[PDB]
Design an enzyme around this catalytic site. Structure first.
Site, mmCIF file in Angstrom:
data_model
loop_
_atom_site.group_PDB
_atom_site.id
_atom_site.type_symbol
_atom_site.label_atom_id
_atom_site.label_comp_id
_atom_site.label_asym_id
_atom_site.label_seq_id
_atom_site.Cartn_x
_atom_site.Cartn_y
_atom_site.Cartn_z
ATOM 1 N N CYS A 11 -27.479 -26.345 28.434
ATOM 2 C CA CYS A 11 -27.315 -25.216 29.340
ATOM 3 C C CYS A 11 -28.511 -24.272 29.259
ATOM 4 O O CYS A 11 -29.570 -24.528 29.853
ATOM 5 C CB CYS A 11 -26.011 -24.478 29.021
ATOM 6 S SG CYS A 11 -25.673 -23.058 30.083
ATOM 7 N N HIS B 11 -22.356 -29.395 28.927
ATOM 8 C CA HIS B 11 -21.982 -29.329 27.522
ATOM 9 C C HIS B 11 -21.451 -30.683 27.071
ATOM 10 O O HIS B 11 -20.234 -30.867 26.948
ATOM 11 C CB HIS B 11 -20.937 -28.238 27.298
ATOM 12 C CG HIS B 11 -21.495 -26.853 27.357
ATOM 13 N ND1 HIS B 11 -22.043 -26.226 26.260
ATOM 14 C CD2 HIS B 11 -21.599 -25.976 28.382
ATOM 15 C CE1 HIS B 11 -22.456 -25.021 26.605
ATOM 16 N NE2 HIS B 11 -22.200 -24.844 27.888
ATOM 17 N N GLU C 201 -21.211 -31.926 24.277
ATOM 18 C CA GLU C 201 -20.459 -31.864 23.031
ATOM 19 C C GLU C 201 -18.958 -31.751 23.265
ATOM 20 O O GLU C 201 -18.189 -31.931 22.316
ATOM 21 C CB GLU C 201 -20.951 -30.695 22.167
ATOM 22 C CG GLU C 201 -20.645 -29.303 22.699
ATOM 23 C CD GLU C 201 -21.664 -28.827 23.712
ATOM 24 O OE1 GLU C 201 -22.288 -29.679 24.375
ATOM 25 O OE2 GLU C 201 -21.848 -27.600 23.844
#
Ligand SMILES: O=P(O)(O)Oc1cc[n+]([C@@H]2O[C@H](COP(=O)(O)OP(=O)(O)OP(=O)(O)O)[C@@H](O)[C@H]2O)c(O)n1
Ligand SMILES: O=P(O)(O)Oc1cc[n+]([C@@H]2O[C@H](COP(=O)(O)OP(=O)(O)OP(=O)(O)O)[C@@H](O)[C@H]2O)c(O)n1
Ligand SMILES: O=P(O)(O)Oc1cc[n+]([C@@H]2O[C@H](COP(=O)(O)OP(=O)(O)OP(=O)(O)O)[C@@H](O)[C@H]2O)c(O)n1
Ligand SMILES: Nc1ncnc2c1ncn2[C@@H]1O[C@H](COP(=O)(O)OP(=O)(O)O)[C@@H](O)[C@H]1O
Ligand SMILES: Nc1ncnc2c1ncn2[C@@H]1O[C@H](COP(=O)(O)OP(=O)(O)O)[C@@H](O)[C@H]1O
Ligand SMILES: Nc1ncnc2c1ncn2[C@@H]1O[C@H](COP(=O)(O)OP(=O)(O)O)[C@@H](O)[C@H]1O
Ligand SMILES: [Mg+2]
Ligand SMILES: [Mg+2]
Ligand SMILES: [Mg+2]
Ligand SMILES: [Mg+2]
Ligand SMILES: [Mg+2]
Ligand SMILES: [Mg+2]
EC number: 6.3.4.2
Lengths: 539, 539, 539
Positions: free
Chosen positions: A393, A511, A513
């Site tokens: 990001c 994102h 993750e």
């Protein structure tokens, strides 16, 4: 045998005492893991006592990072533990809040749906909460009915804000009876160094506080920094009217993935299964044993810098750190994280002093952030030094600003960080906040495509600023490739340098993750850790 | 059939809310009555939160009259209800107090019996109380094991002093489980005249207070001055999580003997029997129906003056009033009691104004009493007027002092009431306090012997002053007969005038009202009420 | 209180051992009466092992009289006990038979409803029976759901025909569990005069036979001619593995109406209520105590002859005898029944010898009957002698034939009894068999209307021959009045003589004994017994 008769859906409530951050959510997730391995269809839920209708308005210094679901709800951090341990995608319904409950009941009142009654905290609010709890028991869209619902009650017993949730839990125990409802209580055992003794009094007071609202714990999780003596467990069991089988010593494990082993070794899952009368089979440890081999017996080691503002001793980056460790697990490398303040990297000498010893740098995303001059300074230093970089990001945004400052755009910035910049290379396309999963298309044989080994992917997004399309042709002269985009190509989703410019420097707006799991590592972090390994080996 | 298998001894705890004097003890006694009629061996017990080791030190303005057992213990008033409704003699063990428990535990500590542990309110005091509760379950001296133990917890829920007793009750429910332990909660429903509504909020708050210590009531006794509407019972059941079968409306009955009928009509006994899983048979109402006929449908009426200091709107004379009513029941006469202050009878004109309308006068005993000049004045007036008199303890003492002042001993008194009297006709034989049952021998064909129809009796005593043997021959010239004595004759136990001197004027040092039962009236009160009837008929 | 929470419908199965006619149906009815008085909504059912699709084809020597329902089904005799003790009207579903079950399953098979399975006695037949059992639990037309279903298994344990019904009962116990299903077993204890000992071995063998199919009785009803000693009950309890509370001594009572008292005195109802965990209240004995006063303490006595063929020591007239005794109860008279054979009344001298001592004569109905010459001979003699007569069905037909032979029609008869008669005054209007309730209209101020005190009535019918309308004007010259008819007047329903011709001689085609109850006597029998009393008093 694998097929069993029907039984009612069992409710298991997890509550906390003494303090927050006791690992209540991790314990609930580990118990869900064990019950899943024993063959039960576990589903999970969290109740948040705060009045925020969703944590999107909060600051990561409060409770850590925010999380995002596939239906696009914005939820607490604990839903991330639930995903990472159950390897599932959870609905937005998995996070209730006092804000939502009160808004719903007030709205229903304005519409007259209570037929002129006085609206009260009991029964109406507790009824809405009990409804939201029992809705989890309903058959899913495919008819699969959960065998156990594990509900985590956030906060601490005795917080004013928890009172309606605990009353709802008490009413659920009344409605369904003890054969269906089990209460697990997590409490702290502090160690006083001057007198060298563990103290059980905080636990006694917490259990008494819980009893004062009509809840009797069935088991106690004694969180401690060292293994609790047996005499103390006996004392706690006696004072708290808890079965001595139900006092579970849970010392601080070196990694969160050892917790299922700790709970299994203590026979918590066996105790829960017996008490709830659930049908079971032995846990097949094959998968998690392999994971723990990758955790505890790596072949090599690598150091990665995590650069941010919240890095001052806070778990604001938990998902990023776990995705990094999962990437290490795919390669059987230990990833050691060096927590680096962004503001020490504003000067080139400071950046060199901070980063010079690491093998890679990670620029995670954030909100309410400031001082990205230091972040971009770290990018500039790392590129000159040859360290690999992954930008998430805001990391991608800083990468693009670095490239802008590489080609002529020295005063370029985001409109977020310099509203008066003459070159807003990052700008609002407040604009539409993109939230949740979106599809994207990748350049064939891009480094991103080489990692994913596909031309099409979907990733979870949370941002509203975008790369300004007016500057693509200008910044491409840096060598940067817009190697991934939205299907129409309108939005940049990934950027990278060609391997011959730098072996690996990649950023993504999403994102990733939040799609990683320890037993299913995400491609980009596998790639990033592989690049860091290659740097360490070649350096 | 009459013979059933063995089952564990069931414990039924009665607790109170909002206020004392709710008829908690009377409700417990009536439930004991019903369970006895259904064939169960009920035994009863009271727990007193006050620290007095026994109420003998108290003043009748605190909690009413004192009571005495056959083993000679001195106990609360409620043991009298237990006797009068179960028609049994109860051990001194039937009244526990905080004073006794703390003294016992402190003594055990001084002797080292806890082996060096820290003595605490939990577990040691609650363990002593739980031991004293479960001791009631042991087989009696003849091997008769009680089927139900009804334990009354004195005080109010939320009094600081009740906390150990309620914790002991909670531990008993934990040890024996719900199938053995039943909680009955008595609460007040006040009526607010200005708005014409019954209020349930005090009951809700009391039940919440009870829940805050870990007790869930199984039934509610709603004490009220008028029958509770059904809508209010439904509201209470809903708010208090109590089965709608368990909300029992218990309005103020005209006499205490109607309470068994009220509880049976509401099916409280059926609810308790079902919930505790006790074996039962239908209640044989024959005896109590006859008693209630004698209560509600008398053939005649008579007025009796009760003269005392505590008469200012207090139940300090409950046993005396009930023994009077039982005497009326034996003759099927209503006895109406006129509560007369002693101090208005000090002057002869005042005594005439107070007593002139009554058909008899009763002089009960007491302690810490003063102003017996008025009592003796009432005796003098009554003797002149021809009204019958019964004197209990102090009543006999005043009778003897009146006789002393009838023969020459104008300054005579008790050494208690004039330590400087030149004629202590009543004197210490502080001397030995005679307590409990003692045998006595009666003059053949004495009025006392004509009543008892025997020459030998035993009565409960509580006093330490006696008739001074030096004055028997002097006071006999009044015409008074020492018509009953101790077996050795050393102590005067009864005095009377011959019927031709006055048709009936009798005194006794003992408290015969403590051996009366409504279904077994005591001879002396039958005689006294018969004399009052004869006066009314002849007057 | 009167309103309780919902609970599942309890099933109570009544089974018989050693022999039939042990009073198994009467015991089931008495238990239903007690459970109704304790406030429960009892419903009842009977399962008949015989293959007859209904008992209409049987002969009253087999099992006594047939019974009829309001929906017009024809059912076993025991449904009459259920009506008489519950005072209810029961559906035709209240009598299942093997005939109906096998016909149903075969029909379903021919239509392929079992989807190609092999149709078997297990599961399919037992499933049909279990379905018919559980259908009784469904809410009635008004939503009133029965609290207890009492099912009587006809026959004896170990009859080949009972095997499917007991297997269905076992499956019901499996499905609903022991908390809902209670087995009551009725067994015989014979007395052997030569050695003067009661023998328990038949009971032991019956209980063993029952256990050999998987049923364990919860209670035993020991039918005997004398009260069973306690030692035998202890032996039976030990040998049979039955709770000693559950062995119930049930000696032959002087009248069937004492049975509720016997069962209550033995606490069978209490045992059942405890074991099924039903909510209860005490039995209100007011009504049945009044009934038993009318039974055991009558003011007078009257003798009535019962004239029939089955009178040779058989209960073929149970409803009629009970309706007679109910009529006696309305007047508080004892009715003594003299069982008179019809064939002894064929000769006038024989009729005089049989009837001369009685105060009234009853001619009940029947089927497959013969020799009505004797019945009509008894009518002729009684009319000459002045005795009152009540004629039921065939009694009315004989009355009409007597009147035919009184006016000129000496060879008149029914076409049933002389197909070649020249005067078939009774004829088929085989014609339509009228079954069940039909409305009728009565002559105003007729003796029938004086009894019923109304002009409109409804009665249960079972017959196919009628009064031939061609002979009304001829036979009216006898003085007989057709004092009741169908609403259109087409069918004669009642006949009578004017009081000045004979004080009371009435007949009806219907069976008013099937609408009588001991607590609600039928008008006609009250009238008949009053007329018999008036005859006895005037004679
Ligand atoms: O973490 P979860 O999973 O339980 O989720 C959580 C954690 C905490 N809370 C609530 O936020 C407030 C302050 O929390 P908080 O513990 O931080 O107290 P504090 O004032 O900050 O003292 P401290 O220094 O110890 O932090 C409290 O009202 C809590 O009930 C919620 O709703 N969900
Ligand atoms: O009667 P029992 O059967 O329950 O036996 C009882 C009644 C009461 N008590 C205790 O005496 C104290 C004051 O009592 P008390 O109700 O009178 O309060 P207070 O200050 O006087 O206010 P109030 O005006 O209402 O009287 C309290 O500590 C009670 O726990 C005991 O031990 N046994
Ligand atoms: O008499 P014999 O000539 O045939 O000689 C007999 C009679 C009986 N027996 C056996 O004794 C046991 C109990 O006998 P029993 O009939 O009395 O049963 P029970 O339990 O006592 O019930 P109950 O007496 O009430 O009927 C049984 O095992 C019988 O097989 C023997 O060996 N010889
Ligand atoms: N048993 C444990 N051993 C070691 N570390 C732990 C343990 N439990 C939790 N943690 C860590 O402590 C932090 C608190 O755990 P968390 O899931 O957030 O519980 P909570 O819901 O109360 O906030 C987490 O970052 C977690 O990684
Ligand atoms: N249900 C009732 N109706 C009428 N009068 C009553 C009732 N219950 C109690 N009383 C009277 O009120 C007084 C209080 O009853 P009591 O036995 O002393 O209860 P407690 O143990 O709480 O003190 C008694 O004198 C009793 O006679
Ligand atoms: N306990 C009893 N005492 C006296 N007479 C009885 C008793 N039980 C039954 N009877 C009579 O014996 C007959 C048979 O009883 P019944 O109800 O028909 O049992 P079943 O259903 O097996 O046929 C009935 O006519 C009844 O009147
Ligand atoms: Mg937290
Ligand atoms: Mg905090
Ligand atoms: Mg009191
Ligand atoms: Mg007080
Ligand atoms: Mg039969
Ligand atoms: Mg037969």
């Amino acid at each position: 045998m694998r097929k069993h008769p029907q039984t009612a859906t069992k409710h298991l409530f997890v509550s906390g005492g003494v303090a927050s951050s006791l690992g209540k959510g991790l314990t609930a997730s580990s118990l869900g893991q064990l019950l899943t391995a024993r063959g039960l269809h576990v589903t999970m839920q969290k109740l948040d006592p705060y009045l925020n209708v969703d944590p999107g308005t909060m600051n990561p210094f409060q409770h850590g990072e925010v999380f995002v679901t596939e239906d696009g709800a914005e939820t607490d951090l604990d839903v991330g533990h639930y995903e990472r341990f159950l390897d599932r995608n959870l609905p937005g319904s998995a996070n209730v809040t006092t804000g939502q409950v009160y808004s719903t009941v007030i709205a229903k009142e304005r519409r007259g749906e209570y037929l002129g009654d006085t609206v009260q905290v009991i029964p109406h609010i507790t009824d809405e909460i009990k409804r939201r709890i029992l809705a989890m028991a309903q058959p899913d869209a495919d008819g699969n009915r959960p065998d156990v619902v594990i509900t985590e009650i956030g906060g601490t017993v005795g917080d004013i804000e928890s009172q309606p949730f605990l009353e709802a839990a008490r009413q659920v125990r009344h409605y369904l009876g003890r054969e269906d409802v089990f209460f697990l209580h997590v409490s702290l055992v502090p160690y006083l160094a001057p007198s060298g003794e563990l103290k059980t009094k905080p636990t006694q007071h917490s259990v008494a506080a819980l009893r004062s609202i009509g809840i009797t714990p069935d088991a106690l999780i004694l969180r401690c920094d060292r293994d609790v003596p047996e005499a103390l467990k006996n004392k706690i069991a006696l004072m708290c009217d808890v079965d001595i089988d139900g006092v579970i010593s849970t010392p601080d494990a070196p990694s969160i993935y050892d917790i299922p082993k700790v709970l299994h070794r203590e026979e918590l899952d066996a105790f829960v299964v017996r008490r709830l009368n659930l049908p079971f089979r032995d846990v097949d440890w094959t998968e998690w044993d392999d994971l723990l081999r990758r955790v505890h017996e790596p072949h090599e080691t690598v150091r990665i810098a995590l650069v941010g503002k919240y890095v001052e001793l806070s778990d604001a980056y938990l998902s990023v750190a776990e995705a990094l460790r999962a990437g290490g697990f795919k390669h059987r490398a230990k990833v050691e994280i060096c927590w680096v303040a962004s503001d020490g990297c504003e000067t080139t000498s400071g950046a060199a002093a901070a980063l010079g010893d690491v093998h890679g740098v990670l620029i995670p995303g954030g909100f309410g952030i400031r001082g990205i001059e230091g972040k971009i300074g770290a990018i500039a230093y790392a590129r000159a030094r040859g360290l690999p970089v992954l930008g998430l990001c805001l990391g991608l945004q800083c990468i693009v600003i670095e490239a802008a400052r590489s080609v002529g755009l020295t005063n370029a910035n985001s409109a977020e960080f310099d509203p008066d910049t003459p070159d807003p290379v990052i700008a609002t396309m407040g604009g539409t906040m993109r939230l949740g999963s979106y599809p994207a298309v990748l350049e064939p044989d891009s480094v991103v495509a080489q990692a994913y080994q596909t031309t099409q992917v979907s990733e979870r997004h949370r941002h509203r600023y975008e790369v300004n399309n007016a500057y693509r042709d200008k910044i491409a002269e840096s060598g940067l490739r817009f190697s991934g985009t939205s299907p129409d190509g309108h939005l940049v989703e990934f950027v990278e340098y060609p391997p011959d410019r730098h072996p690996f420097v990649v950023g993504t707006q999403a994102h990733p993750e939040l799609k990683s799991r320890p037993t299913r590592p995400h491609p980009l972090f596998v790639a990033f850790v592989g690049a860091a390994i290659d740097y360490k080996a070649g350096e």
